[PDB]
């Protein structure tokens, strides 16, 4: 089920469920990041994995994030989707995140 990754101001209603990506002129650039807090009011809260889990206190197991690209057919592109285990802070450069 959909994540509200675009939980920002000036994202009104159904615009919150999508992340608009554009052509950039710098390399290795960050697009978005997802706070993995389900207990806190973040992008994972109003999901089927989020709402049912908040009736419970403890949780275990693997999560899968699926990203559907909704550009045109003539849109090409390559993304990297990094998951960083805790212990540090969040990675901000792609050199740091692909580790």
């Amino acid at each position: 089920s959909m994540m509200e990754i675009n939980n920002t101001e000036s994202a009104v209603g159904m615009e919150r469920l999508k992340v608009d990506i554009s052509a950039l002129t710098d390399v290795d650039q960050l697009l978005f990041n997802i706070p993995l807090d389900i207990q806190l009011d973040g992008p994972l809260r109003n999901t089927l994995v989020g709402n049912i889990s908040r009736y419970y206190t403890h949780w275990s197991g693997s999560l899968e994030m699926t990203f559907m690209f909704c550009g045109s057919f003539m849109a090409t592109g390559k993304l990297i989707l990094c998951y960083t285990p805790p212990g540090g802070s969040c990675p901000t450069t792609r050199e740091t995140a692909m580790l």
Binding site: E4, M14, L17, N51, S72, M74
Partner: protein, 237 residues
Amino acid sequence: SDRVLQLKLGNSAIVTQEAANYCCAYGEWPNYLPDHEAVAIDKPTQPETATDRFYTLKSVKWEAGSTGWWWKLPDALNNIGMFGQNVQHHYLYRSGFLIHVQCNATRFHQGALLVVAIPEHQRGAHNTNTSPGFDDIMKGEEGGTFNHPYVLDDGTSLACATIFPHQWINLRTNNSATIVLPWMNAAPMDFPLRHNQWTLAIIPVVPLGTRTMSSMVPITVSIAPMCCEFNGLRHAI
């Protein structure tokens, strides 16, 4: 292979060349009512090719500021063809549905439609304590428009609406969605004019956008009832 699909029901066929591996709702296929589940004791009529066939609704204009579209079943078909005449002359109906939704555009258009079939979509109104009236629910063949598609017009969420039987029309991948609905009720048959059991919802999660020549892109809905039974023959309304 799984991108081409011909759906033949009755005297109606639909071919499509960008499909997306059609959805059977809850893994279930439509059947007739078996004898161990029947209630109404009279012999049902089963007009097979006369009703189990694709009925094409009026197309809606997919536009820039669109919120969404919804049709309630069998209300969208209660006045079309021989399915509509069997509804008006009988007290009970029982059918599953084969919904095929069509929306194509060029390879320079983008957009994503959530084509979701919602069982018992008991709608709510906005900012009032009054329940939705009869004319707010029973739209017929025209269908309705989502007031707030983000909450599915019932206080729930569009985000979690993928728990229902759904497909997507992503314009870069496919141009059609097909959902095969079984009978979905608490009872075996039902009065079709005061109860809708499936709401077909089509929602722009990603809006239509391109920078090429701005043609009209519509969204067309073809719904085939499947395994129609009708009980309690009387006059028409």
